[PDB]
Design an enzyme around this catalytic site. Structure first.
Site, PDB file in Angstrom:
ATOM      1  N   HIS C  61       0.826  -1.202   0.000  1.00 10.33           N
ATOM      2  CA  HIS C  61       0.000   0.000   0.000  1.00 10.33           C
ATOM      3  C   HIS C  61       0.866   1.260   0.000  1.00 10.33           C
ATOM      4  O   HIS C  61       1.943   1.286   0.604  1.00 10.33           O
ATOM      5  CB  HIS C  61      -0.931  -0.004   1.205  1.00 10.33           C
ATOM      6  N   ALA C 113      13.231   3.169  15.449  1.00 14.87           N
ATOM      7  CA  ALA C 113      13.735   1.981  16.128  1.00 14.87           C
ATOM      8  C   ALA C 113      15.247   2.089  16.202  1.00 14.87           C
ATOM      9  O   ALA C 113      15.885   2.476  15.228  1.00 14.87           O
ATOM     10  CB  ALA C 113      13.343   0.731  15.368  1.00 14.87           C
ATOM     11  N   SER C 217      18.140   5.802  10.525  1.00 14.18           N
ATOM     12  CA  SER C 217      17.242   6.817   9.989  1.00 14.18           C
ATOM     13  C   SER C 217      17.351   8.129  10.754  1.00 14.18           C
ATOM     14  O   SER C 217      18.271   8.317  11.561  1.00 14.18           O
ATOM     15  CB  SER C 217      15.816   6.293  10.091  1.00 14.18           C
ATOM     16  OG  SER C 217      15.400   6.269  11.446  1.00 14.18           O
ATOM     17  N   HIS C 254      14.987  -8.880  13.167  1.00  8.22           N
ATOM     18  CA  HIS C 254      14.076  -7.824  12.749  1.00  8.22           C
ATOM     19  C   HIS C 254      12.621  -8.076  13.163  1.00  8.22           C
ATOM     20  O   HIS C 254      11.897  -7.127  13.425  1.00  8.22           O
ATOM     21  CB  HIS C 254      14.160  -7.582  11.240  1.00  8.22           C
ATOM     22  CG  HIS C 254      13.387  -6.384  10.788  1.00  8.22           C
ATOM     23  ND1 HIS C 254      13.616  -5.122  11.292  1.00  8.22           N
ATOM     24  CD2 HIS C 254      12.372  -6.258   9.902  1.00  8.22           C
ATOM     25  CE1 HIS C 254      12.775  -4.269  10.734  1.00  8.22           C
ATOM     26  NE2 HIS C 254      12.011  -4.933   9.887  1.00  8.22           N
TER      27      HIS C 254
END
Lengths: 285, 272, 282
Positions: C61, C113, C217, C254
């Site tokens: 999506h 995370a 990130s 993960h």
């Protein structure tokens, strides 16, 4: 990435320049922080804007092209680069390398360079001169070394050593000249670490870099030095301490670049004098 | 840059090689430093040049292009890579990754690699062997990791762990073989840090790296190791100390012994 | 292939969004670990898929830009981020943040995370970023490399109070009065470009660099936000405890990372909602 800094392209640029001037330079000078006035005081100068040299890389300070300045300084033939190609601007390895390799073919034997740096070493003061005796090339240790890509064998070897990269004899002369002229107290030697930039360093970054054994941090110079050593040009490089690095987040002090420019402008007169007096005493001639 | 190292392209390269040879390799070997023999000592050899394989990456001239040598070494089927692709040359991630992924499809379960490195650990001497027990991937931490880009799920997971990256059982066997054959005094274990290169490290860089916890430094190997672990190939890697690092600015030979060590390790490797 | 994140292109994107919604957001939120359910809490909302915004980057999506009201304040929520380990360009990461600025965002809140380097951290702990080490940025992969876009900010941005001290204080006070102050720490985040998890030797080095958590990130978005004068609040969820020992059988997985994030999602959402609740109003 512009034109490859190979022997064919570099020769073409060198020959174009040699039609525009009869000065065969012995010393190349890359003007950084504090060297604005030295550029102006070159005697019998001939100014060649970058725009007038085909295939030479193009850079501008808000519209005004950089220039190559040929002439003399303390009786010695020089070429001055007024306008540099910093990697944070997005310039390619070939763009940064070409001008230095052009200097090699023109006859340059020694490269002198200044820059603006933050003072990590806690003994440094604003306005201090820190002669580079070594460096840590953080981009180079990653995969952003200026020499990455096909080696141009015409200029140097695949795996250059950087052992005496900041010529120990030139460093000794620079210290001696400062001492003889009464400003030896302003002169230090140290390790310069390159932050690719263009962000100033966070307090945590500065603390890390200080603990790595770094005395000053800046965003330039090392790529030029690597190309210079690769083709056998001796290097003298000095950082002007234009900010004292902040090591704690709990502190309202910060680097603002205008005070960085102010330190450069205020130490320009002395740095000009120093460089002129070094050039006067350089060996070979 | 050449062709994406996805399962379709890698499949095609593997299938073409499988027409040129019946040898199904169980062990892949990349010799970097001590590459004198080994490729000489392989019995029933079949030398396949890189130019003979379509979509396989090609070396840049040098008067001596790469070869893939298949055969047997101390009773085991092997494939040796003669001709490496180092990142300082400007090769893309897909160029470096494709060969290792081809090894996977060909049947390789263990990858053995040697390289040349600068000794950082102060107890090392020129000529020493340093088995890699871990690494620091400076380019990888700095956003030049070989796996950057879309993940090829057919080979491995998006976020690979690097636990026991340098298989502990293979290192223990390697140490057993060296001490059994009289050159155990040369063998160390250590952390290898990658300098993307191609400059050698300055004294200040060497000091920083030593204090980061690194024992040797080189310009290769880690990208290949990362691809290998990503697709489930066990790795054994060794550095030959070819330069001792100077720490302050103020200041062929092991070729036959390394190929012999590798030959004797393969002899003792477990076989399914 | 991606459009330059210059004022011309960012204006065109923002003007297209402004025809699809009347909501002028003053808080931008980037959903990371623990913020999966945040879009559900947004009221009077309108979901705009990235696919229906020309020249806006595309992520899966499709990702959405959700506008609406959270704890009485106008917000825009980014559901779908652009991680550099996926191969996205600097312009791709920068454009969304600059769009937020033109839309009216004054505060950016972000979660991620991270692996816990600091040995006092427990799994599921919240570590508010008070500083960072941008390893890619030091190594010439800074998101701002290239011509400076002067409409947005200065050539050489300082990163002195990058993680707004007043927002950090408020976040700590909100946790403490709602009874989960024991889960909340403050720390230095280091960016590993990724996508590999960190080796034991890498973790040891990072811990000794002065780092508390490591992730893949967030720093690039923070730099762009600070460059254009958006205040930043950022929190790492400790989704794995870093393994410093090569001989250990423990390792980052993960699926366990995602499970940890999902478990804390209700609490993280409530925390963010209650922070926004107590933000000074003019």
């Amino acid at each position: 990435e512009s034109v490859t800094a190979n022997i064919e392209n570099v020769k073409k640029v060198a020959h174009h320049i040699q039609k525009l001037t009869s000065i065969v330079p012995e010393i190349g000078i890359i003007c950084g922080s504090g060297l604005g006035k030295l550029a102006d005081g070159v005697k019998d100068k001939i100014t060649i804007p970058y725009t007038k040299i085909p295939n030479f890389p193009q850079t501008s300070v808000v519209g005004h092209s950089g220039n190559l300045i040929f002439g003399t300084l303390s009786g010695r033939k020089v070429v001055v680069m007024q306008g540099r190609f910093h990697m944070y601007e997005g310039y390619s390895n070939d763009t940064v390398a070409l001008p230095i390799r052009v200097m090699k073919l023109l006859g340059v034997k020694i490269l002198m360079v200044s820059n603006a740096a933050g003072g990590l070493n806690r003994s440094l003061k604003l306005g201090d001169f820190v002669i580079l005796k070594d460096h840590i090339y953080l981009p180079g240790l990653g995969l952003n070394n200026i020499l990455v890509g096909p080696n141009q064998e015409a200029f140097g070897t695949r795996f250059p050593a950087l052992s005496n990269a900041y010529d120990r004899d030139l460093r000794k002369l620079a210290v001696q000249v400062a001492e003889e002229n009464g400003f030896g107290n302003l002169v230090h030697q140290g390790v310069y670490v390159m932050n690719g930039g263009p962000c100033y360093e966070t307090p945590a970054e500065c603390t890390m870099l200080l603990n790595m054994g770094c005395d000053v941090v800046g965003m330039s110079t090392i790529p030029e030095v690597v190309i210079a050593r690769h083709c056998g040009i001796q290097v003298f490089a000095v950082s002007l301490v234009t900010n004292i690095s902040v090591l704690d987040v709990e502190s309202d002090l910060k680097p603002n670049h205008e005070e960085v420019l102010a330190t450069g402008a205020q130490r320009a007169e002395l740095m000009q004098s120093w460089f002129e007096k070094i050039i006067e005493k350089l060996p070979k001639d």
